[PDB]
Each structure stands twice: as C-alpha cells, then as structure tokens.
C-alpha cells in the first residue's frame, strides 16, 4: 500500500505564538500553496482543492484533482478528503494539524491515489503516481515553512 499512498509528519514553530499558529493552520489553501508541486490551490473557506501532476510517457503531465473539507478543531484544523467521481484518477488529501501554547505546530499528512477502474501498463502508471505523491509529501515541510515569518 506504500506505492499509491504517501505519509508525512513534522513540526514547525510559529515565531508569533499560538494565536498566529492557530490562524495559520486554519487557512490551508494559503499554507499548502507554498508547496510548488501542488497546483491550482483554491478554497471557499469550507473546502480546499487543487491538483497534483503525474508525468507519464506520451501523455506527459496528467493532472489528478483533490478536494478536501476544512474542519476547524479545538487545537487547529483537519483536512478530510471528499470522494471524487471515478472517471479519472484523483487524490485524497488528508491532514491533521495542532498548535500548542508557544506556537509550536504539529502536522500529519496522508495522500492516497485513487486510480480509475495489462500488468506492465498498470505498474508504470502506479510508479508515476507513487513518485508524484512522495515528491509532494517530502516537499510539505519546506512549503509550509515558506509561509512563516522569519
């Protein structure tokens, strides 16, 4: 299950404190936008959406959309993925974030690729999809850190 899913967890301190940390984690479209491998980030305050790019031979860059519900929690926020239609591949982006007193933030993100429904062809697509999920996951800390004041 590690090919079509990725996981990333890390911490960052918000230098302006808990209130600033809470606000930061509660506006995901803006925070996620710093991750370059996420494209077309947008939000209406209730949900956030965008796309990941999977590069394959001949077709080139293939966009897989995602859309998640923004849930405000007592300690921060969560992203809960919405199920998209099955006619093309898509991604489920899940996340949990907390802000402690002093402004230290804890992040956990999970990505699941949902492919549409020979063996050689499937392995190539799955490999390309997996590389994309991992590239986004590994880039999350840098991306969120870019949205913090120095």
**Annotated binding site for Ca(2+): which residue ranges?**
2, 5, 7, 63, 134
Q: Which of 86, 118, 114 is nearest to 4 (CA)?
A: 114
* 6, interface contact from a second copy, Ca ion, none, CB < 5-8 Å by kind: Ca ion
Half-sphere exposure of 101 (CA within 13 A, CB side): 0
Q: In whole angstroms, how close is the CB of 115 to a second copy at the nearest point?
A: 4
Q: Which of 106, 107, 100, 108 is nearest to 19 (CA)?
A: 100
**From CA 86, how far away is CA 109, in angstroms rounded?**
23
* 138, interface contact from Ca ion, a second copy, none, CB < 5-8 Å by kind: none
Q: Encode burial over 80-91: b for 16+ CB neighbours within 10 A, e otherwise.
A: ebeebeeeebbb
User: Is 38 an interacting residue with respect to a second copy (CB under 8 A)?
Assistant: no
* 127, interface contact from a second copy, Ca ion, none, CB < 5-8 Å by kind: a second copy
**Is 57 in contact with 42 (CB distance < 8 Å)?**
no
User: Is 61 an interacting residue with respect to a second copy (CB under 8 A)?
Assistant: yes
Binding site for Ca ion (CB under 5 A): 2, 6-7, 63
Whichever of 57 and 74 has its CB closer to a second copy, that residue is 57
Among 19, 56, 145, 146, binds a second copy (CB under 8 A): 56
């Amino acid at each position: 299950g590690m090919i079509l899913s990725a996981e990333q967890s890390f911490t960052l301190r918000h230098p302006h404190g808990q209130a600033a940390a809470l606000a930061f984690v509660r506006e995901p479209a803006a925070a996620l936008a710093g991750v370059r491998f996420l494209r077309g980030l947008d939000s209406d305050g209730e949900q956030v959406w965008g796309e990941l790019l999977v590069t394959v031979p001949l077709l080139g860059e293939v966009d897989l959309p995602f859309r998640s519900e923004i849930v405000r929690t007592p300690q921060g926020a969560e992203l809960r993925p919405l199920t998209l239609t099955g006619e093309r591949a898509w991604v489920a982006v899940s996340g949990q974030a907390t802000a402690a007193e002093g402004g230290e933030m804890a992040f956990a993100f999970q990505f699941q690729a949902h492919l549409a429904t020979g063996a050689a062809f499937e392995k190539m697509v799955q490999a390309a999809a997996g590389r994309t999920l991992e590239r986004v996951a590994k880039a999350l800390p840098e991306g969120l850190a870019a949205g913090l004041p120095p």
